[PDB]
Enzyme design. Sequence first.
Site, PDB file in Angstrom:
ATOM      1  N   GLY A 184       4.147   5.929   9.297  1.00 45.23           N
ATOM      2  CA  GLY A 184       5.454   5.729   8.714  1.00 45.23           C
ATOM      3  C   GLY A 184       6.194   4.515   9.228  1.00 45.23           C
TER       4      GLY A 184
ATOM      5  N   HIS B  41       0.806  -1.215   0.000  1.00 42.51           N
ATOM      6  CA  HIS B  41       0.000   0.000   0.000  1.00 42.51           C
ATOM      7  C   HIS B  41       0.844   1.273   0.000  1.00 42.51           C
ATOM      8  CE1 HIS B  41       0.686   1.035   4.229  1.00 42.51           C
ATOM      9  NE2 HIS B  41       0.489  -0.235   4.533  1.00 42.51           N
TER      10      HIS B  41
ATOM     11  N   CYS C 237       5.166   1.472   9.010  1.00 38.78           N
ATOM     12  CA  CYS C 237       4.919   0.314   8.164  1.00 38.78           C
ATOM     13  C   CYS C 237       6.178  -0.035   7.383  1.00 38.78           C
ATOM     14  CB  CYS C 237       3.752   0.583   7.213  1.00 38.78           C
ATOM     15  SG  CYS C 237       2.178   0.898   8.061  1.00 38.78           S
TER      16      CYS C 237
END
Lengths: 306, 306
Positions: free
Chosen positions: B143, B41, B145
């Site tokens: 952030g 994503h 991820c």
Amino acid sequence: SGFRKMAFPSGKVEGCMVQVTCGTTTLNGLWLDDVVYCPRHVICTSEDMLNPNYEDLLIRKSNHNFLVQAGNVQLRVIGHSMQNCVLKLKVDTANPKTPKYKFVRIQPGQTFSVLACYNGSPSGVYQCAMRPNFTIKGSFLNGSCGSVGFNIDYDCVSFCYMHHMELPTGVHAGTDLEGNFYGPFVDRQTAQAAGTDTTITVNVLAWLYAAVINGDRWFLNRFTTTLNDFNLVAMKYNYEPLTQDHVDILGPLSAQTGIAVLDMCASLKELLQNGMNGRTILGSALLEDEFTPFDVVRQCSGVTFQ
Amino acid sequence: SGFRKMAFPSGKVEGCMVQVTCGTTTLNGLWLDDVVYCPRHVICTSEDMLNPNYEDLLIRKSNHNFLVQAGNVQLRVIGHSMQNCVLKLKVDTANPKTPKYKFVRIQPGQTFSVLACYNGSPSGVYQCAMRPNFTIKGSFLNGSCGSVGFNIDYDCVSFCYMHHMELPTGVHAGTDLEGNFYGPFVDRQTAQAAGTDTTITVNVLAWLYAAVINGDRWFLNRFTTTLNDFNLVAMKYNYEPLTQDHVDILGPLSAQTGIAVLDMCASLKELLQNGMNGRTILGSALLEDEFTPFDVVRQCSGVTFQ
């Protein structure tokens, strides 16, 4: 979201961990530039620890009596010196992985990350604080001496602790990187008292501020209190006396959450007098005092390092 | 002595953390050999997350739409591919700091160390477990991820987790390094339930075994019980059903302490039915289930890594 006991990245400190053997005693060392730092009782035997004369025991030792190992590579000791309770071993090679570093002596209540090591190899990393009685509650087996505690400022490692001893109470004690012990402890196998362990009050308040940020806010009462009245309750529970500097440091946390520091002190006062009734705060069933106010600000903003 | 929540040394994983920017979305990536792994994503916008067609969104993207940064150095993407919920970015450069690594899919209850990162730079490291509902309770801001969970076998890093999402309950979810989610979670901004969170029973028993080793043994009762009778009490408290394999793994811990596993199950049974009366076990005021039996054996023997 989420709030956890976090330790600094240990990569820069792993490159400075070596093995130090003297005679038949072995521990860990910190290899920065052309100097290796290690606890001075590497020169002692089990019989020597009962009552050692470190000056006399060191006199019978020369440079070649110190086996400094970095992986498979042996390091050549070209000089040794005793600075208080640590030994400084000058070697013919600078550490190629030396990070930007300083030697700092932390104050009680400050937190740091410990990198546990055995035979100069890292086993784990965890976060703990300098208790007001100048002890720490860590995890240290035999051979863990020489392991260091540190903080990191982007690219600068701030060494502040080196493990030396385990007191008979199962708690730990050590020195800074200049050899000076934290507290009234001596590197000698004799019965020593740690003193009354008090709670870092300003750290509990910052931890309660982190819970409010992370949705856990049931403890927020309807009361307020004063500094002198809250300290009257803090003394009864062996809590550190809160001062205006402690209030000043909690300012940014008080501004973000909109909760005045004195209001949180009343919520903390009620938690001391009424317990917690089986509920939890941030997954903990007691009050956590191993989080400095900057530990909360750092985690809730996500500052990075390298 | 002492027993703490310990994380693996993060040095080998720090060398594999990069920044990945696509369009105006940025997260962290794992750079092993000539491939960078990141959550898929990164190709989505805030509007895309509500209901994304990743195949359609990826079609409009080419190699030059991915900004892989490693410090100051840009990495040239020469190939991209979607493996389930992760993106594989082939680059023209092998990572010079690639450790010996494998991709493993851990089972519920197993623990691992998370290295939280922002903009490809490590911020901290902490230990957590795969909850039976396939969630984890960590610390993840925006952030974070692309941050990975891992175990280390001396010199081999076993990557097992990569952070993708925060559920509306403040809990976290993610995938392995092949892109397959842990649990029934999808990378999409829609309401998702985590399911009933149960307690890892075999982990609580190993934790109670660690307390006995470290002097804290007041909870040792005078009773014993059976597997089926203890599980009758475990069900009432939403505890994981204990099996013979769970008993087999606790064998070494039962032999070192001389406490049969069934005897400890009765002591755990009484702790569930009578609470803890304000006392503490290993400094915790509740039952800790984020310590696998091997986590205890590893800490009480001090195995090292490099």
